[PDB]
Amino acid sequence: APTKEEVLLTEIRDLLKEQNNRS
Amino acid sequence: EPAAAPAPTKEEVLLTEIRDLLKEQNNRS
Amino acid sequence: EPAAAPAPTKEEVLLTEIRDLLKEQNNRS
Amino acid sequence: APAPTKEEVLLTEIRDLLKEQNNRS
Amino acid sequence: PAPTKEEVLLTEIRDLLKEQNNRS
Numbered sequence: 731a732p733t734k735e736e737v738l739l740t741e742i743r744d745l746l747k748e749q750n751n752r753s
Numbered sequence: 754e755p756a757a758a759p760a761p762t763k764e765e766v767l768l769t770e771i772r773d774l775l776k777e778q779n780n781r782s
Numbered sequence: 783e784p785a786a787a788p789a790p791t792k793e794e795v796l797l798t799e800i801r802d803l804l805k806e807q808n809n810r811s
Numbered sequence: 812a813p814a815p816t817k818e819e820v821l822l823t824e825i826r827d828l829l830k831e832q833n834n835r836s
Numbered sequence: 837p838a839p840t841k842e843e844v845l846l847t848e849i850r851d852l853l854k855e856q857n858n859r860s
Contacts, residue, residue, distance in 0.1 A: 732817070734761060738768035739821035745775040746828040752782070753835065763790070767797040774804040778811075792839075796846035803853040807860065815841070822845040829852040836859065 732740075790798075815823070839847075 734765045735768060736817050736821065738765065738772050739818060739825070741772050742768065742775060743821055743824050743828065745772070745779060746825060746832075748779060749775070750828055750832055750835070752779075753832070763794050764797065767794065767801055770801050771797070771804060774801065774808055778804075778808055792843050793846065796843065796850055799850050800846070800853060803850065803857055807853075807857050811860070819841050819845065822842065822849065826845055826848050826852070829849060829856070833852055833855060833859075836856070
């Protein structure tokens with residue numbers, strides 16, 4: 731399984747992608 | 754033999770807070 | 783006072799700074 | 812260089828995204 | 837005592853966020 735840390739970093743990456751897309 | 758569900762890493766707790774802040778920021782708009 | 787934890791890792795310090803910056807920006811925006 | 816860790820790859824992408832934001836703001 | 841790649845990246849991320857806050 732991926733680590734909790736990898737999953738959280740993936741979420742963070744995705745949230746920043748979404749910020750950049752909506753700006 | 755050690756704990757099966759030990760406390761998460763300090764890294765994990767901080768990344769959680771960072772995640773929460775970015776998500777809340779997004780949720781404002 | 784609460785006990786002072788063992789010395790934080792460089793990772794922890796940087797992540798805490800990042801958290802602080804995001805909190806600051808959320809608060810003033 | 813040796814293969815990057817999964818965390819390094821993600822942090823690099825996060826860096827890249829923030830740099831893009833900086834350039835675009 | 838060389839920095840780790842993780843440290844190098846987190847330092848840049850921190851600096852970019854400081855810049856964002858300053859320019860906002």
